[PDB]
RNA sequence: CGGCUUUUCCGGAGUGUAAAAAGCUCCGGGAAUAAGGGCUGGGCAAGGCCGGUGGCAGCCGCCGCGGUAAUACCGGCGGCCCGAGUGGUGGCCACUAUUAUUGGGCCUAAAGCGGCCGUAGCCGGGCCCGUAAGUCCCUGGCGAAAUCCCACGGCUCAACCGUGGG
């Protein structure tokens, strides 16, 4: 069955990137998936995006620029304070600041560098580089 | 709580490269034991570890300890006065060994041979700031670098000591 | 499938699974149940003291052919009897019947058989509180 | 240095261009070496590369990593044959690895070195470690992985003057690549020296595969080849 | 030490910079004869259609 | 030569306590009587009222620290200070 | 060959003792006056000639050496590592991602139940509204000392101790 749209969508995206396909659709469209996708779009790894209703859950269409090397989902929602980010980054990012992490804090889901800026911890969600 | 050694043994005491580099540095400095060279490298490694942690640290305490690190390493006379945290990682064991009392007093031309300098050190014919010492492994600090002189009470203070002229002509010649 | 469980609210089965499968290995099981020290003739003693009974030589396992000398010793701590190899060139000449001796492990893999001599587990160090190595070298004299 | 320039001149005299890569290097229409790799032609004459990389001629820049005495069983005797693995390379980010069959040690060595010469690849270097961050090619720019046979090798940036943290085969090959500080993690059996060397080679080749955002070049002082 | 920064070629069909020893290809445009279209080995094997930036022409 | 650093006064007990230094470069460490007879000169003290606590010559040095103490009356050490220090300085058999 | 200080050793002067002792600290006479352990075929790499034993004696963690010339046993030479420590044994962590959350595999190397059903457990579709238990940031109390990290100061330096900060 389906237990999390986000991980499957990120895996699908990465796979399509390996074959270098140009346009991708994510079937289970949610608000959270849209917000996270906007979040890394802010940093340029993906280009335009759109939502299209289908009368069931909407679909999310993206065109890929093929500059991502791996976009995975951190399933077990590890909560982390401000200080320990470097501990987790070493676990998922290849090098210093190489890409981002996605954290849901009290204000929402946004990048991890910006999270360090505002100094607000939260739940690790996904990573992409 | 038990007092621990301040030096670390190599991971493999019969690798040719490290053994021969040690041998070279031993004949270029004539330290009695590899224990001493290992100790100096231990000091180096501790400085580097502190530097790496601090580079990997964020907080007012991190900055304060960084300042303390820079201040001390400069005080020892190991780095230029504009040194930053970056350049310490490029430090070498020879930097530390130069700062040794034996090396400094030998470069000050008070001995034909650095082993002769060591003999003077143990025999307390040498003084610092008007205080005698007997430890050739001492890493002297910068602000005392001009105060290393012959012990006032030693016969070597007399410029007519039979060795002293040989020292002086070897210095010139 | 994916190595499971991994749920945020599932640590119990994780540690259960881990602890269960720990029992598969052997060394940790040996430590906890204290099997070695309830089968140890020496009771974890780095050395033991005993009395000599007889001298026998054993045939080296093939392809090594040799008469490795050794002795039978009953130790004083409990009264069990064991075999002890005697290292040294002409070593056996020094050792006699009814000799107080000191014995320790031989250093084979997992303290077991050492190379080409099977069954033996121990070597002698001091006889009558006198080290055997110098006796082999003849520097010292047996009492 | 002038020794290697004159070496390049005399080999230019002696060697005659054969393939469609020979003329533009003999004619001087190609002088930078990376013009070979960027366009990605095929390299088939060894004499090409030493015209632009006479540094390969150095005794130190060539290394024989492994020597093996393989056997073939026949009805009429065990025919031996030496397989030797050797690594050549300039000390500024260009290396090649080669294997040579042979009936004697010298011929095996020569063929292996030639095949290494035919196997030059271009690397990147930088400083992406978590402490050093000195924007200098003292280490690999970012964590990299390479796989071959059973061996999987992950090379992670380290700080300056750490030393090069890898098994001896990796030690030599990375020394020949102009990289001197790195952490290493090894999966699979590392007693198979050939597989280990080739996996390290593959990781180094993989270094160029990662897409890099433009700012990262200056963030790490990413050097493409020579410094 | 003048910084000799070079312009690593990029495959139009994927945008990925070309690794050194890849068997990629380059060629002037087939339609407008000005654009130096690159094609990377990955883009070559599966042969996805590539787009000329200038004339808009598409080519397997 | 003898050079003083501290003269301070505990008036609750009536003692002037004194920390000083003896510069004796190249000669053996001085004894108590001679340094006592020296100190008593330029401080204007009664020797019978004065007791030297300690003298300590550091390793590899020609300047030795010294602490001495002088009260007002004879009863003060008989009631406060202990017999043995009077014994060492000779005020008591 | 010629000469140079005298580590330790003899005498004296102080701390020292509530009682010496403590040989600590300063001066004087003053010797060139103390050095081993293990290894030497390869994993280790770290290092070759000779005399003898001839699978007898023995060596050896493991691989393995000698059955008549042993570079691998024994003796000598020469050499390699460390050094007032070196060697053997036994116990624990690493090596080992040979316990695997980070991070182990299960067709052929040990490893999927013969198959289906299902309870507790674990993990669960999308959207709106409200809470804020978990979640995160600020703030009070609290998690002693000793031990740990850093600067400075005292003991010649250090180890040790103090002041300050973590």
Swiss-Prot record, chain B:
Entries under NCBIfam families matching the protein: PRK04051.1 (NF003139), uS4_arch (TIGR01018)
GO biological process terms held by the UniProt record: ribosomal small subunit biogenesis; translation
UniProt keyword Ribosomal protein present: yes
GO molecular function: rRNA binding; structural constituent of ribosome
Keyword Transmembrane: no
Purpose: One of the primary rRNA binding proteins, it binds directly to 16S rRNA where it nucleates assembly of the body of the 30S subunit.
Domain named S4 RNA-binding: residues: 99-170
Family, per entry: Belongs to the universal ribosomal protein uS4 family.
Protein name, entry field: Small ribosomal subunit protein uS4
Subunit structure comment from the entry: Part of the 30S ribosomal subunit. Contacts protein S5. The interaction surface between S4 and S5 is involved in control of translational fidelity.
GO cellular component annotations of the record: small ribosomal subunit
Any Pfam family the entry gives: S4
Organism placement in taxonomy: Archaea, Methanobacteriati, Methanobacteriota, Thermococci, Thermococcales
PANTHER family linked to this entry: 30S 40S RIBOSOMAL PROTEIN (PTHR11831), 40S RIBOSOMAL PROTEIN S9 (PTHR11831:SF5)
Alphabetical UniProt keywords: Ribonucleoprotein, Ribosomal protein, RNA-binding, rRNA-binding
From Swiss-Prot, chain C:
One GO cellular component term: small ribosomal subunit
Gene3D superfamilies: Nucleic acid-binding proteins
Subunit architecture: Part of the 30S ribosomal subunit.
CDD domains xrefs: Ribosomal_S23
A GO biological process held by the record: translation
Signal peptide positions (record): none
Protein name: Small ribosomal subunit protein uS12
Similarity comment: Belongs to the universal ribosomal protein uS12 family.
UniProt-listed SUPFAM superfamilies: Nucleic acid-binding proteins
Organism annotation: Pyrococcus furiosus (strain ATCC 43587 / DSM 3638 / JCM 8422 / Vc1)
Primary role: With S4 and S5 plays an important role in translational accuracy. Located at the interface of the 30S and 50S subunits.
Pfam families named among the record's database cross-references: Ribosom_S12_S23
Swiss-Prot record, chain D:
Residue ranges of domain S5 DRBM in the record: 60-123
UniProt entry tagged with the keyword Ribosomal protein: yes
GO cellular component, one term: cytosolic small ribosomal subunit
GO function terms (MF aspect): rRNA binding; structural constituent of ribosome
Coiled coil spans: none
Pfam families for this protein: Ribosomal_S5 (PF00333), Ribosomal_S5_C (PF03719)
A GO biological-process term: translation
UniProt-listed InterPro entries: Ribosomal_Su5_D2-typ_SF, Ribosomal_uS5, Ribosomal_uS5_arc, Ribosomal_uS5_C, Ribosomal_uS5_euk/arc, Ribosomal_uS5_N, Ribosomal_uS5_N_CS, Ribsml_uS5_D2-typ_fold_subgr
Record keywords: Ribonucleoprotein, Ribosomal protein, RNA-binding, rRNA-binding
Subunit description: Part of the 30S ribosomal subunit. Contacts protein S4.
PANTHER family named in the record: 40S RIBOSOMAL PROTEIN S2, RIBOSOMAL S SUBUNIT
HAMAP family: Ribosomal_uS5_A (MF_01307_A)
Entry comment, domain topic: The N-terminal domain interacts with the head of the 30S subunit; the C-terminal domain interacts with the body and contacts protein S4. The interaction surface between S4 and S5 is involved in control of translational fidelity.
Homology family: Belongs to the universal ribosomal protein uS5 family.
Biological role: With S4 and S12 plays an important role in translational accuracy.
Protein name: Small ribosomal subunit protein uS5
Organism: Pyrococcus furiosus (strain ATCC 43587 / DSM 3638 / JCM 8422 / Vc1)
Lineage summary: Archaea, Methanobacteriati, Methanobacteriota, Thermococci, Thermococcales
Gene designation per UniProt: rps5
Curated annotation (Swiss-Prot), chain F:
Cellular compartments per GO CC: ribonucleoprotein complex; ribosome
UniProt GO BP: translation
Superkingdom as given in the UniProt entry: Archaea
GO MF annotation: an example: structural constituent of ribosome
Keyword annotations from UniProtKB, A to Z: Ribonucleoprotein, Ribosomal protein, RNA-binding, rRNA-binding
Gene3D superfamilies documented for this protein: 3.30.70.330
Entries under InterPro entries matching the protein: Nucleotide-bd_a/b_plait_sf, Ribosomal_eS24, Ribosomal_eS24_CS, Ribosomal_uL23/eL15/eS24_sf
Family to which this protein belongs: Belongs to the eukaryotic ribosomal protein eS24 family.
Summary of subunit composition and partner proteins: May be present in 2 copies per 70S ribosome. Part of the 30S ribosomal subunit, where it binds 16S rRNA at its canonical site at the bse of the body, as well as a possible second 50S binding site near 23S rRNA helix 45.
Name of the protein in its database record: Small ribosomal subunit protein eS24
């Amino acid at each position: 069955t389906l237990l999390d749209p986000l991980a499957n969508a990120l895996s699908h995206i990465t796979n399509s990137e390996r074959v270098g396909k140009r346009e991708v659709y994510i079937k289970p469209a949610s608000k959270l998936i849209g917000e996270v996708l906007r979040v890394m779009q802010k940093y340029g790894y993906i280009g335009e995006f759109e939502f299209i209703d289908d009368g069931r859950a909407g679909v999310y269409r993206v065109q890929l620029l093929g500059r991502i090397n791996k976009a995975g989902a951190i399933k077990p929602r590890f909560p982390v304070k401000v200080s320990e980010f470097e501990k987790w980054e070493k676990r998922f990012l290849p090098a210093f600041e190489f890409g981002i992490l996605i954290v849901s804090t009290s204000q929402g889901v946004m990048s991890h560098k910006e999270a360090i800026e505002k100094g607000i911890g939260g739940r690790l969600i996904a990573y992409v580089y | 709580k038990r007092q621990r050694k301040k030096y670390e043994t190599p991971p493999h005491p019969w690798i040719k490269e490290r053994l021969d580099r040690e041998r070279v540095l031993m004949d270029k400095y004539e330290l009695k034991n590899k224990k001493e060279l290992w100790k100096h490298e231990t000091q180096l490694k501790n400085f580097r570890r502190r530097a790496r942690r601090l580079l990997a640290a964020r907080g007012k305490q991190a900055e304060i300890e960084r300042e303390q690190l820079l201040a001390r390493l400069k005080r020892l006379g190991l780095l230029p006065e504009d040194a930053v945290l970056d350049d310490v990682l490029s430090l070498t064991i020879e930097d530390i060994l130069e700062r040794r009392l034996q090396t400094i007093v030998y470069k000050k031309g008070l001995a034909r041979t650095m082993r002769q300098a060591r003999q003077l050190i143990v025999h307390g014919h040498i003084e610092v700031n008007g205080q005698i010492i007997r430890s050739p492994s001492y890493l002297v600090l910068k602000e005392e670098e001009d105060t290393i002189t012959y012990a006032r009470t030693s016969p070597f203070a007399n410029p007519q000591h039979p060795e002293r002229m040989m020292i002086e002509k070897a210095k010139q010649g | 499938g994916k190595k499971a469980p991994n749920g945020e609210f599932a640590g119990r089965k994780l540690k259960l699974k881990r602890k269960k499968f720990r029992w598969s290995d052997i060394r940790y099981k040996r430590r906890v149940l204290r099997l070695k020290e309830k089968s140890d003739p020496l009771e974890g003693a780095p050395q033991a003291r005993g009395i000599v009974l007889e001298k026998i030589a054993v045939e080296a396992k093939q392809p090594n052919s040799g008469m490795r000398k050794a002795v039978r010793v009953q130790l004083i701590k409990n009264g069990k009897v064991v075999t002890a190899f005697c290292p040294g060139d002409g070593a056996i000449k020094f050792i006699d019947e009814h000799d107080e001796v000191i014995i320790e492990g031989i250093g084979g893999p997992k303290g077991g058989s050492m190379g080409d001599i099977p069954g033996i587990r121990y070597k002698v160090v001091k006889v009558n509180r006198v080290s055997l190595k110098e006796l082999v070298k003849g520097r010292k004299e047996k009492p | 240095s002038q020794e290697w320039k004159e070496y390049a001149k005399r080999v230019l005299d002696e060697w005659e261009p054969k393939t469609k890569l020979g003329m533009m290097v003999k004619e001087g229409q190609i002088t930078d070496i990376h013009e070979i790799f960027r366009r990605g032609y095929q390299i088939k004459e060894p004499e090409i590369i030493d015209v632009l990389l006479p540094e390969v001629n150095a005794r130190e820049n060539q290394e024989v990593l492994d020597i093996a005495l393989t056997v073939r069983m026949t009805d009429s005797g065990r025919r031996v044959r030496f397989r030797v693995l050797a690594a050549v390379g300039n000390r500024d980010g260009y290396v090649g690895l080669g294997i040579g069959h042979g009936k004697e040690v010298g011929i095996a060595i020569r063929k292996a070195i030639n095949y290494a010469k035919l196997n030059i690849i271009e690397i990147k270097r930088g400083c992406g470690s978590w402490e050093c961050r000195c924007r200098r090619p003292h280490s690999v720019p970012f964590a990299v992985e390479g796989k071959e046979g059973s061996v999987r090798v992950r090379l992670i940036p380290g700080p300056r003057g750490l030393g090069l943290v890898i098994g001896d085969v990796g030690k030599k090959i990375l020394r020949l690549a102009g990289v001197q500080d790195v952490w290493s993690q090894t999966f699979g059996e590392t007693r198979t020296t050939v597989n280990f060397a080739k996996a390290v080679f593959n990781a180094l080749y993989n270094t160029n595969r990662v897409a890099i955002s433009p700012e990262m070049i200056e963030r790490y002082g990413i050097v493409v080849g020579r410094a | 030490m003048v910084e000799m920064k070079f312009e690593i070629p990029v495959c139009t069909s994927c945008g990925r910079e070309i690794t050194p020893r890849e068997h990629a290809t380059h060629f002037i445009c087939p339609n407008c004869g000005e654009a130096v279209i690159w094609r990377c080995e990955s883009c070559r094997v599966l042969a996805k259609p590539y787009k000329c930036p200038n004339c808009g022409w598409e080519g397997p | 030569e003898i050079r003083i650093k501290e003269i301070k006064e505990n008036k609750l007990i009536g003692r002037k306590e004194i920390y000083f230094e003896i510069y004796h470069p190249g000669e053996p460490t001085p004894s108590r009587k001679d340094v006592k007879g020296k100190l008593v000169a330029m401080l204007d003290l009664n020797p019978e009222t004065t007791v030297i606590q300690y003298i300590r010559s550091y390793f590899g040095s020609y300047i030795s620290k010294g602490y001495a103490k002088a009260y007002d009356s004879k009863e003060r050490m008989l009631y406060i200070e202990p017999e043995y220090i009077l014994i060492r300085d000779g005020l008591i058999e």
